[PDB]
Design a protein around this ligand. Sequence first.
Ligand code: CL
Lengths: 267, 272
Amino acid sequence: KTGMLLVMVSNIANPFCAAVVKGIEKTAEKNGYRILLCNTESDLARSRSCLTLLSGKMVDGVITMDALSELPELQNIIGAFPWVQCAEYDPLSTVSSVSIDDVAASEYVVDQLVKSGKKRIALINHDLAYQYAQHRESGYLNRLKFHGLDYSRISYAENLDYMAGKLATFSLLKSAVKPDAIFAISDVLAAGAIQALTESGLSIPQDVAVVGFDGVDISQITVPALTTVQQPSEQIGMKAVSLLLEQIHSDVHHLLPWKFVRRQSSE
Amino acid sequence: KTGMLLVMVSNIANPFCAAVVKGIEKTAEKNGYRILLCNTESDLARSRSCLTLLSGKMVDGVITMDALSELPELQNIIGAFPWVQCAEYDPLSTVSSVSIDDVAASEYVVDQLVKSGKKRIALINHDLAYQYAQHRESGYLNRLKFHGLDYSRISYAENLDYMAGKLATFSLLKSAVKPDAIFAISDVLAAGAIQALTESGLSIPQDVAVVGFDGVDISQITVPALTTVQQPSEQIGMKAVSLLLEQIHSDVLAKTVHHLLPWKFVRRQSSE
Ligand SMILES: [Cl-]
């Protein structure tokens, strides 16, 4: 009845979010909706504020990209109002969602690194409030144990910006035992790694391979170009709206396929 | 008790917007406000729609980063509601604004390229509905004529992304006379110019210099690092809120003001 949807975004400065929002705006407008965004950064104080649009009767449905951490409380506020969780969701909950299989993806990256002769794979992680951070860290650890590797180092980036990945990398290079590959949970973090490696005069991938995650345009801009896990980000957004519309017209955790895109930073 | 403010964003995928939003949020949230965004992209139907929040009393004021020419189309909806324009500059407009001086920055860009010996400077422009894109184009064309340069050329990126930059660049290289320098209206487009230039085997700056605009992180990621016009992007958003708060505040009758914040030409390897 209002012709408006609310989108809670985790980080508008994350280019993954921007590509997912583009897909959401496309499907919403194809279906006669317009979209309002809240840059929540999974801060329930901002969420509580923007959700007054439900009770204010200003929107017909909600899509969230907020951290798993926040989802139980969001459920208390949102209740049965149309809702889809997008990229970030709770697989134990009854709320409809769409994402990829993060665990499968990070396991495949580690397997490819191992198959290529790398043994000392470090992870650059971000905020464990997010289930996708949790999953990618489990997939990583899963395959280190499997292949029987004994190096394991995870560096937690504070911000999702290149400088965070860069300093994470210098941090990893400080040890006696240095990685021979760095898997970053985002392409922005990985571009920062590539820059630290380069200023350190390490060849990529001959000294240290780098693999990122998401397949956003930065992965094509970096030298060397960045091997990454490409999400179908735009379609994630489109499918979130399609699932939402189904609740709006009434009265599943959907997984879309990812692709490993092999580039020079790993080959 | 906590209010909300509406931001009408010109392109949520433009890292300059994200930087202005960041400053908006910092100032707003110290003053008891949270922020709602609309990715309006100077689409009038989108703008009209998100502006029902003002009428509906869900937000206390609007900061717009849309094309300047949208202002008169919305004046009837906004009336006396608190209203501030970012990144467009018209001192005859009655809507208070905060931005840089685009004409002075772009002429300065051209003067620096000409000082360094460049004589065929091209422009990658994007969406001319924005007055800043018009001013950067005039500033570029007038300053070439001012230096008596014979070469002029402009190629228009359809989207704001690196591929659009790269395509604009291939188009400028496909010509009788090639540029010896490329000035882009955003660092995003310039990163694509650097990519096409490199894949074409041109040396930067030796064969073709590149200059961008805005001073966003991509400009520190490209190889060579990207000479650019650095905007104080966060300060633009914080100031926009400050101006919006004078309007909201009961004890001041706010007047029109058009703040110009300083830009800086930041020299990197892509031009030096
Ligand atoms: Cl950027």
